[PDB]
């Protein structure tokens, strides 16, 4: 098995960047690496094939160089519709194999997340399930930490995560944690509270109720 | 034009059996080798089999081989993948891709073009409709002019559901976050939305949440609590 490993594995730049991704394989392979374009939820499209030919109808401002071992694609002047995940892929020996991608992101300026909580709907305590959401909303970069603290106890591994893609209009991100536990357990405990930290906070920003809005 | 339309998708229990279809159209399909390709939820592109243009030739991936089996019917411009006993790994969307010259040109293969992908979830969990729950922001709060409120769309399967806000009407600040699996085999799913703090109580919010695989539909105000 031929391996490809891309770097970076994600990147932000700007409409009119010059940007670089380079694809690094295991084993010699001359010129049989080929680079894919995909967006969220589409197929992949052939960007460039035999390391450096340009497929038809793929703009100029796409290319690649590089044999061997060591390949690169080049934007060279980044536009909006190139935002997007980049894939390299040998064809020098079967299996075939792919890189593990390369996310070009939008670059802008930091931004501190809105953090809000949510107590668990009566609706919900019925089924015998309490969920408790905490929303991190529009910050900038994607990097962040959640703390789940319950009765001032910090929580790991009752809790999952989802992130958005770039908002189309500004650019950011935003976040939805929730912690999930029992009807029962939830009745047990008072205090609920999620603390963040993000490079656009001075200190961790946290949101707490108490149970039965006390 | 080049047409690969991919059929075939769905729920598979573990172990069982199913098969994918992608028909072309718009190049002659008997003098091209065609590759499926698969890609987990948020994984990269993985490469699953390749069959020659007479079908003599098949080789896989090393974690498919042994139970997929490729094949095609030249005669209806049909590729086709084999999936028996299939596991939770194999959850993925497949792509079939044409190469991009004739099996006999010897060039450097790559995938020119693709089909549009079907999805298979490998899962026992049974289909059901999701319970929806109000994210509701507190009436006392006086942190901001600004309030989030959101739905909780909670325990269904399969994916996907659809969230609007107010039928489509509140598009300003909307933010449906990708959906979580859950260790039940359930998914979980939250939208919220931002908006103005002094319009809780007096502008009505409306989450429509649809989920096809059950016909359901469910309409839930969001109100302030307290």
């Known amino acids: 098995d031929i391996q490809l490993t891309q770097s970076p594995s994600s990147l932000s730049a700007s409409v009119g960047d010059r940007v670089t991704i380079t694809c690094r394989a295991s084993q010699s392979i001359s010129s049989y690496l080929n680079w894919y374009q995909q967006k969220p939820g589409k197929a992949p499209k052939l960007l460039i094939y035999a390391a450096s030919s340009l497929q038809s109808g793929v703009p100029s401002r796409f290319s690649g160089s590089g044999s061997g071992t060591d390949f690169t694609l080049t934007i060279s002047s980044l536009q909006p519709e190139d935002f997007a995940t980049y894939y390299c892929?040998?064809?020098?020996?079967?299996?075939?194999?792919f890189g593990q991608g390369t996310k070009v992101e939008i670059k802008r300026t930091v931004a501190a997340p809105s953090v809000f909580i949510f107590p668990p709907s009566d609706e919900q305590l019925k089924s015998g399930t309490a969920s408790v959401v905490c929303l991190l909303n529009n910050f900038y970069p994607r990097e962040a930490k959640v703390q789940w603290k319950v009765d001032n106890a910090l929580q790991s591994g009752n809790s999952q995560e989802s992130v958005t893609e770039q908002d189309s209009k500004d650019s950011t991100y935003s976040l939805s944690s929730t912690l999930t536990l029992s009807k029962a357990d939830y009745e047990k405990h008072k205090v609920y509270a999620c603390e963040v930290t993000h490079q656009g906070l001075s200190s961790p920003v946290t949101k707490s109720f108490n149970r039965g809005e006390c | 034009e080049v047409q690969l339309v991919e059929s075939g998708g769905g729920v598979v229990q573990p172990g069982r059996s199913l098969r994918l279809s992608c028909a072309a159209s718009?190049?002659?399909?008997?003098?091209?080798?065609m590759h499926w390709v698969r890609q987990a939820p948020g994984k990269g592109l993985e490469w699953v089999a390749v069959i020659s243009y007479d079908g003599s030739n098949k080789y896989y991936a090393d974690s498919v081989k042994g139970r997929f089996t490729i094949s095609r019917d030249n005669s209806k411009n049909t590729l086709y993948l084999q999936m028996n006993s299939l596991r939770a790994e194999d959850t993925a969307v497949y792509y079939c891709?044409?190469?991009?010259?004739?099996?006999?040109?010897?060039?450097?293969?790559?995938?020119?073009?693709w089909g549009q992908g079907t999805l298979v979830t490998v899962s026992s969990a049974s289909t059901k409709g999701p319970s929806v729950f109000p994210l509701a922001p507190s009436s006392k709060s006086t942190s901001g002019g600004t309030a989030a409120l959101g739905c909780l769309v909670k325990d269904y399967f399969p994916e996907p559901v659809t969230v609007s806000w107010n039928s489509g009407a509140l598009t300003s600040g909307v933010h449906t976050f990708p959906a979580v699996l859950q260790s039940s085999g359930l998914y979980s799913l939250s939208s919220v939305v931002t908006v103005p703090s002094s319009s809780l109580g007096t502008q009505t919010y409306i989450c429509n949440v649809n989920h096809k695989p059950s016909n359901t539909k469910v309409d839930k105000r969001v109100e302030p609590k307290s």
């Open positions: 892929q040998q064809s020098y020996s079967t299996p075939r194999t």
């Open positions: 718009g190049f002659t399909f008997s003098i091209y080798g």
């Open positions: 891709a044409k190469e991009g010259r004739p099996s006999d040109i010897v060039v450097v293969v790559a995938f020119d073009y």
